[PDB]
UniProtKB/Swiss-Prot annotation:
The gene is CDK5. The modification N6-acetyllysine is found at residue 48. This is Cyclin-dependent kinase 5. Dysregulation of CDK5 is associated with neurodegenerative disorders such as Alzheimer, Parkinson, and Niemann-Pick type C diseases, ischemia, and amyotrophic lateral sclerosis. InterPro entries: CDK (IPR050108), Kinase-like_dom_sf (IPR011009), Prot_kinase_dom (IPR000719), Protein_kinase_ATP_BS (IPR017441), Ser/Thr_kinase_AS (IPR008271). Phosphorylation on Tyr-16 by ABL1 and FYN, and on Ser-146 by casein kinase 1 promotes kinase activity. By contrast, phosphorylation at Thr-15 inhibits activity. It comes from Homo sapiens. The lineage of its organism: Eukaryota, Metazoa, Chordata, Craniata, Vertebrata. The modification Phosphothreonine is found at residue 18. Proline-directed serine/threonine-protein kinase essential for neuronal cell cycle arrest and differentiation and may be involved in apoptotic cell death in neuronal diseases by triggering abortive cell cycle re-entry. Interacts with D1 and D3-type G1 cyclins. Phosphorylates SRC, NOS3, VIM/vimentin, p35/CDK5R1, MEF2A, SIPA1L1, SH3GLB1, PXN, PAK1, MCAM/MUC18, SEPT5, SYN1, DNM1, AMPH, SYNJ1, CDK16, RAC1, RHOA, CDC42, TONEBP/NFAT5, MAPT/TAU, MAP1B, histone H1, p53/TP53, HDAC1, APEX1, PTK2/FAK1, huntingtin/HTT, ATM, MAP2, NEFH and NEFM. One of its GO terms (cellular component) is neuron projection. Signal peptide: none annotated. Inhibited by 2-(1-ethyl-2-hydroxyethylamino)-6-benzylamino-9-isopropylpurine (roscovitine), 1-isopropyl-4-aminobenzyl-6-ether-linked benzimidazoles, resveratrol, AT-7519 and olomoucine. Activated by CDK5R1 (p35) and CDK5R2 (p39) during the development of the nervous system; degradation of CDK5R1 (p35) and CDK5R2 (p39) by proteasome result in down regulation of kinase activity, during this process, CDK5 phosphorylates p35 and induces its ubiquitination and subsequent degradation. It holds the Pfam family Pkinase. One of its GO terms (molecular function) is acetylcholine receptor activator activity. Keywords: Acetylation, Apoptosis, ATP-binding, Biological rhythms, Cell cycle, Cell division, Cell membrane, Cell projection, Cytoplasm, Kinase, Lissencephaly, Membrane, Neurodegeneration, Neurogenesis, Nucleotide-binding, Nucleus, Phosphoprotein, Serine/threonine-protein kinase, Synapse, Transferase.
């Protein structure tokens, strides 16, 4: 059963516990093991139905509850640490393409991830990217239980303003943040100190949304009127290594109003991926 696996090292933290690199004692296969709740039950329920090359594979469940996953050598945070500077623009494109393919697959099946960040993206030695950690995910946008939301830096303006409900638009904002991070050698786009600082960094770059751009903004549970910062002329200053077509895609992912954010399917059709 559980003792069939030898724990090798602690590799992470999920939404509900610790992740270990482990070895199957009978076969010597290397796996990622999560030992432990609603987050575990939800992850099993979703992953039994979400099979895609850009989604982490759930191999087995042992009953203590043990979840046996596919092993990847790094998460994107570790990948960035090892890159220690600019990523090759082709790797930037490949990793974004794969992330959007995985997200596209989820969204077409009415699943939003809700916890998209570099620690939840796995990178294997063949340059393949996988989405992991579906413990906060929602099916049909239905809340399962909770204040539990994605870490501050990847939170969209609607969520920062207290929206409790959202569509797959939540993941497209996080994808835009990760795209800027990929293009910037792992440097975060909006590394806010708290909610107020997060909203200020977002609006200072993109501009504070007008009534015309976002009519319902004023109705949000935690809405606060911010200074009307102008929309920065170009993203060339924040993503210097990203070409003009890349920056156009980035702008379409980073719309403050959730309804205006490009979908994963539309992003995959963007000219950025022309020669791919
Ligand atoms: N932090 S790290 O050592 O680069 C690293 C983390 C991982 C993870 N694998 C999985 C699999 C499933 C769920 C979460 C994680 S986190 C694989 S390598």
């Amino acid at each position: 059963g559980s003792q069939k696996y030898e724990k090798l090292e602690k590799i992470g933290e999920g939404t509900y516990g610790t992740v270990f690199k482990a070895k199957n004692r009978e076969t010597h296969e290397i796996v990622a093991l999560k030992r432990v709740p609603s987050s575990a039950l939800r992850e099993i329920c979703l992953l039994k139905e979400l099979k895609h090359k850009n989604i982490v594979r759930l191999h087995d469940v042992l009953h203590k509850l043990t979840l046996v996953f596919e092993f990847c050598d790094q998460d994107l945070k570790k990948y960035f640490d090892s890159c220690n500077g600019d990523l090759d623009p082709e790797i930037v494109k490949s990793f974004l393409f794969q992330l959007l393919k995985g997200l596209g697959f989820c969204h077409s099946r009415n699943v939003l991830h809700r916890d998209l960040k570099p620690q939840n993206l796995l990178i294997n030695r063949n340059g393949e990217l996988k989405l992991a950690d579906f413990g906060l995910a929602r099916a049909f946008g239905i809340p399962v239980r909770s204040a539990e939301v994605v870490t501050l830096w990847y939170r969209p303006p609607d969520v920062l303003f207290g929206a409790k409900l959202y569509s797959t638009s939540i993941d497209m904002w996080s994808a835009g943040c990760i795209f800027a991070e990929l293009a910037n050698a792992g440097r975060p786009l909006f590394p806010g100190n708290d909610v107020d600082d997060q909203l200020k960094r977002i609006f200072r770059l993109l501009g504070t949304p007008t009534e015309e751009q976002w009519p319902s903004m004023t109705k949000l549970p935690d809405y606060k009127p911010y200074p009307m910062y102008p929309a920065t002329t170009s993203l060339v200053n924040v993503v210097p290594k990203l070409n003009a077509t890349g920056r156009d895609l980035l702008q379409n992912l980073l719309k403050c109003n959730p309804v205006q954010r490009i979908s994963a399917e539309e992003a995959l059709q963007h000219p950025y991926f022309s020669d791919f």
